Design a binder for this molecule. Structure first.
Ligand SMILES: N[C@@H](Cc1c[nH]c2ccccc12)C(=O)O
Ligand SMILES: [Mg+2]
Ligand SMILES: [Mg+2]
Ligand SMILES: [Mg+2]
Ligand SMILES: [Mg+2]
Ligand SMILES: [Mg+2]
Ligand SMILES: [Mg+2]
Ligand SMILES: [Mg+2]
Ligand SMILES: [Mg+2]
Ligand SMILES: [Mg+2]
Ligand SMILES: [Mg+2]
Ligand SMILES: [Mg+2]
Ligand SMILES: [Mg+2]
Ligand SMILES: [Mg+2]
Ligand SMILES: [Mg+2]
Ligand SMILES: [Mg+2]
Ligand SMILES: [Mg+2]
Ligand SMILES: [Mg+2]
Ligand SMILES: [Mg+2]
Ligand SMILES: [Mg+2]
Ligand SMILES: [Mg+2]
Lengths: 117, 201, 144, 64, 17
RNA sequence: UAGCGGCGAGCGAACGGGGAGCAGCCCAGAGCCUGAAUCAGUGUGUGUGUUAGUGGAAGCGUCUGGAAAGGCGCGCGAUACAGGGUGACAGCCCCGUACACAAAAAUGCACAUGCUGUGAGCUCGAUGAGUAGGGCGGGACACGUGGUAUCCUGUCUGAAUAUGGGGGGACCAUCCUCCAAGGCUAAAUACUCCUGACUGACCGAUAGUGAACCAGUACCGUGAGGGAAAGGCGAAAAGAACCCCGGCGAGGGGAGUGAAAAAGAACCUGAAACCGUGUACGUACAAGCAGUGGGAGCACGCUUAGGCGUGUGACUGCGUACCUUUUGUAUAAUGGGUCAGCGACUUAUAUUCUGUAGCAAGGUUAACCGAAUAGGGGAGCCGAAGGGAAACCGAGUCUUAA
């Protein structure tokens, strides 16, 4: 019972080379090179799913820090005053009100100042 | 129990051990698989690196040519070289214990009764070796795919069934596990129902 | 039941190991042989009883005894075998005809193993003390 | 084909009732004068093969 | 064919004995 | 297994049992009586096989289609539904098949018969000498010189003749068994250059023979010798009349054939590497395993009272390939130019453990026989009892005087 590998091998190779669309040079044409590229693309995508959470929070902190100092208080004192006032809005939403509703954000700074003072 | 007949609406008395025991699926599987392994002929072979035609000359010198090491053109890595683990002719037959073979027949036989795929008569023959006679007889009984087991095989019935591919006719000594499971119905003459039970002890 | 409705008993058909067929299989790239060495080579491995060059066990220890040619032509008979002869008389010839001892046996002994519930006549055999009491308890007799 | 017994092992081990092997003790062939009688007296009876050595013996004597 | 002439020459090959 | 063995690696019987097949004779010599068995050769007859052959059943309507053997409807043959072909898949179109027949001539068997050579039976007698054995050296016996029986002989010797000789594993005695030194003999057994039929959980063009093809060829070597690559138009050549550009070219464009010509002979299908043409986006102030997470703009589609899909990706955070070998590799250690195809834990037979099925103090047969995966065959093997070096003893036994 001789088995020929032609039809199965071609389909396994075609699966990898479809994931390599858009890569430069041999990385989208040549299996030995496209295989290593699709593996490293999955290594990066796993690693960068953790980092997407770190990079967005770091961005929200910078936009809260900027809008708070426009109201006369720093970030580290603004967040502390929200804890003493028992306000529990996360930084994702605070960075959203800072940009889109600056009159609500002022009301948050006054509440933080009243509790901190 | 007693199998009801179809010639006289009489009954035939049969052993409970032979026609009434439970179905032992794991034992009958080992017996129909062993049957099929014994029908294999197993004739094939390939050539190792020893038997491929060629010379024993080393293709190029061991060192200095810049090519991978080679020692033979018959190497199984090379095109047109030997097969690594080439086949030989082999015997694929297995052993069945006598008691496991007889036990599977009783499990098979009692399942046919339980699924009313077994039909008992004492009258089954034809007057001339004509295929159209047997085919008309089977039409009356509402049988199309059927195994007919007879006490002693008649020449008229053997010759009348050769050209019908859905019909096989056998003597009581020539039943086998695989044929009882293959055909849709089994017809036994009440003298074959006799002889099978002494054979099955 | 049809030819495509029969299945084997669960746990009867373990699949065999297939070495060198990938990472995911657990036996790839080396086939469970570990890294280099004599034992990892094709056809490698040391012979039976090799200990590294240290004088092996079956050459460290002395030989003892001899083999007796008389022991091969001697048999034991159990008490449960006495009911299996024909005619109620037990001798060498009747034990060979019952397929109890081999055709080349010349001496036999009846030992206390099993039990006897019928009167037999043991003839020409050696009988242990325990079996002599057991044969006579059932109504038999022993001669020589 | 049939496995072949290591014929020099069969001259040195005998199998016992529960599957162990018995053997003769070493050190009782010569310079015996200088040995103590207490030492020699304990080397006379046959011994049993230890647990670390059973694997080697069983492979050598497949028909024992 | 044979080896390159500089790969056979002792002077070129044997520079670090 | 018993044994042999630097008692190592290893080598490895016989006796006895079950089967297949079965067959016994002649010379070393005279007489009586003859040709009486048997075999060999030839001739003829009879039967039978081989080498060419003969006959061999039974289907049309309609739908799709280039074409019907296919779908659907209604029939018939079958001792024939093995197989192959036919414009797609045919029991009934063809060749066949089951079955039934056939030989002027040559030949293989088996008988019978004729002739030729052969001599059958009885009585009495004889009973294989440089031989058996020995010394020395080697070889074969499972047996390596060992305590080594038996066989063979290069060399030197050397008997007794049924009132006698050989063997029975050193050797001797008793007993048992058989007659060397002359010869012939069927079957069961081994094999396949070659012929025929059939079969395959064998291959299907880098496989299977080295060779599906004008292959042991081309080609290579002084020579012995080594040794390739290369299959497929179509159902049918209907293999492209004629016209046009061109060199009275190559090549192409039409026309025509065809179901199809992007089936056009470099011809079924026609993948990937590799090379191009067209369109959308990006790209000429910008530094690195070339991705990944975020992300504007643009282009094309969608669908609505919107932002979704596809392509591209300015800018930006993080980010030094893979295999191998190593304490440890981005390593400036190994390996790989890339693609497509092939390429490495198998097979047989012993043995132990695990799972599972059967039967269970029992389980199971091997060769072989068999109208043959059935049934028979229990020869054997393993288990139910051990201890001892062994005789021996035995639910005990060895140790020891205990
Ligand atoms: N260098 C010279 C001579 C030469 C021939 N073969 C050689 C081999 C090794 C050294 C030198 C040579 C050449 O190439 O013609
Ligand atoms: Mg090949
Ligand atoms: Mg059988
Ligand atoms: Mg692992
Ligand atoms: Mg390695
Ligand atoms: Mg190492
Ligand atoms: Mg190792
Ligand atoms: Mg004809
Ligand atoms: Mg002698
Ligand atoms: Mg003797
Ligand atoms: Mg092809
Ligand atoms: Mg080929
Ligand atoms: Mg083509
Ligand atoms: Mg720019
Ligand atoms: Mg390591
Ligand atoms: Mg190092
Ligand atoms: Mg590093
Ligand atoms: Mg490198
Ligand atoms: Mg570099
Ligand atoms: Mg390299
Ligand atoms: Mg590849």
């Amino acid at each position: 019972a001789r088995v020929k590998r032609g039809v199965i091998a071609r389909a396994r190779h075609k699966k990898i080379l479809k994931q390599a669309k858009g890569y430069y040079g041999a990385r989208s044409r040549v299996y030995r090179v496209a295989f290593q590229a699709v593996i490293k693309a999955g290594q990066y995508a796993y690693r960068d799913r953790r980092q997407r959470k770190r990079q967005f929070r770091q961005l929200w902190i910078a936009r809260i820090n900027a809008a708070a100092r426009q109201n006369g208080i720093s970030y580290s004192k603004f967040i502390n005053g929200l804890k003493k006032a028992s306000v529990e809005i996360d930084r994702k939403i605070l960075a959203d009100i800072a940009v889109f509703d600056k009159v609500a954000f002022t009301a948050l700074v006054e509440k933080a100042k009243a509790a901190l003072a | 129990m007693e199998l009801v007949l179809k010639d006289a609406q009489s009954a035939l008395t049969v052993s409970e051990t032979t026609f009434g025991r439970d179905f032992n699926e794991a034992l009958v599987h080992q017996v129909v698989v062993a049957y099929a392994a014994g029908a294999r002929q197993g004739t094939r072979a390939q050539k190792t690196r020893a038997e491929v035609t060629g010379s024993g000359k080393k293709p190029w010198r061991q060192k200095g040519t810049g090519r991978a090491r080679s020692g033979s053109i018959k190497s199984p890595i090379w095109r047109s070289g030997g097969v690594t683990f080439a086949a030989r002719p082999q015997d694929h037959s297995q052993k069945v214990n006598k008691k496991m073979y007889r036990g599977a027949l009783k499990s098979i036989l009692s399942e046919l009764v339980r699924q009313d795929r077994l039909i008992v008569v004492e009258k089954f023959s034809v007057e001339a070796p004509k295929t159209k006679l047997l085919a008309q007889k089977l039409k009356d009984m509402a049988l199309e795919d059927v195994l007919i087991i007879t006490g002693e095989l008649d020449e008229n019935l053997f010759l009348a069934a050769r050209n019908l591919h859905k019909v096989d006719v056998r003597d009581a000594t020539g039943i086998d596990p695989v044929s009882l499971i293959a055909f849709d119905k089994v017809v036994m003459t009440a003298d074959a129902v006799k002889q099978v039970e002494e054979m099955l002890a | 039941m049809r030819l495509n409705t029969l299945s084997p008993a669960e746990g009867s058909k373990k699949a065999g190991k297939r070495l060198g067929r990938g990472i995911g299989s657990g036996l790839g790239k080396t086939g469970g042989r570990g890294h280099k060495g004599q034992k990892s080579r094709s056809g490698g491995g040391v012979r039976r009883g090799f200990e590294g060059g240290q004088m092996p066990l079956y050459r460290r220890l002395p030989k003892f005894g001899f083999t007796s040619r008389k022991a091969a032509i001697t048999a034991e008979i159990r008490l449960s075998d006495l009911a299996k002869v024909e005619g109620g008389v037990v001798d060498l010839n009747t034990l060979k005809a019952a397929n109890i001892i081999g055709i080349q046996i010349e001496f036999a002994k009846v030992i206390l193993a099993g039990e006897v519930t019928t009167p037999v006549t043991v003839r020409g055999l050696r009988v242990t003390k325990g079996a002599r009491a057991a044969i006579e308890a059932a109504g038999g007799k022993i001669e020589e | 084909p049939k496995i072949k017994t290591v014929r020099g092992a069969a001259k040195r081990f005998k199998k016992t009732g529960k599957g162990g092997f018995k053997h003769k003790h070493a050190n009782l062939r010569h310079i015996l004068t200088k040995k103590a009688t207490k030492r020699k007296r304990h080397l006379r009876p046959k011994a049993m093969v230890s647990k670390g050595d059973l694997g080697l013996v069983i492979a050598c004597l497949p028909y024992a | 064919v044979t080896s390159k002439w500089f790969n056979i020459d002792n002077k070129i090959v044997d520079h670090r004995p």
